[PDB]
Design a protein around this nucleic acid. Structure first.
Length: 224
DNA sequence: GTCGGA
């Protein structure tokens, strides 16, 4: 997962997590309005610190000083809990990135066709993220990654990997600072939303170019 | 110390 839509108001997403969570984030009624959220930008990220929830703009990408290559944007759930690189993020930098759905590109030959993937029941998604804390320091190299998992069922037909999406109840547990890395691994294993809860459709190729914006990017298209 | 298009 390297592109998604986060277009609604923050209250719209937070209300699915809990009554209290929505009250605990300062009021900002503006729809986030982003139909083409791309790595290397700052993205509103939900987390907990000092027993309080926070929604901060955080760089999507992770590139510590000692990392000579371009920023990572994903971390594999298979190994992130024990990775030399991601272990500290799994333990102390868990977060949630909400979204309306995400884009995946199917490589039908030498070209790519984008699909928008969303919950069949019309709810937004909560993607599991890990990152560098303190998140609020506006670091532009040490941000967050979206945790990935193996594509299951029909998603396998689009791409071999997928974001780890948590149910709202799991998303709330994921963010708790007092839990073990092992508890987090069990939340990730127990709270993942399987492919049969999603629908998807092809969308215009225009989304691939980050310059393109607007609700059209997620509309279904005929020709593929 | 690892994994999107353009």
């Amino acid at each position: 997962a390297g592109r998604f839509a986060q277009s609604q108001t923050r209250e719209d997403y937070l209300a699915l997590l809990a009554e209290d969570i929505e009250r605990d984030i300062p009021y900002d009624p503006e729809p986030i309005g982003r139909y083409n959220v791309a790595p290397g930008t700052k993205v509103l990220l939900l987390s907990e610190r000092d027993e309080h929830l926070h929604l901060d703009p955080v760089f999507w990408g992770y590139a510590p000083g000692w990392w000579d290559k371009p920023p990572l944007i994903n971390a594999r759930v298979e190994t992130a809990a024990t990775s030399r690189m991601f272990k500290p993020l799994w333990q102390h930098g868990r977060a949630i990135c909400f979204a309306d759905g995400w884009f995946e590109w199917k490589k039908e030959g030498d070209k790519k066709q984008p699909f928008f993937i969303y919950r069949a029941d019309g709810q937004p998604i909560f993607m599991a993220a890990i990152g560098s804390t303190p998140f609020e320091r506006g670091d532009e190299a040490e941000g967050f990654l979206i945790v990935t998992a193996a594509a299951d069922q029909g998603l396998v037909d689009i791409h071999d990997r997928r974001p780890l999406v948590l149910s709202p109840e799991a998303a709330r547990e994921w963010m708790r600072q007092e839990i073990s890395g092992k508890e987090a691994s069990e939340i990730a294993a127990s709270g993942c939303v399987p492919a049969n809860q999603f629908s998807w459709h092809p969308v215009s190729r225009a989304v691939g170019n980050v310059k393109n914006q607007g609700a059209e990017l997620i509309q279904p298209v005929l020709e593929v």
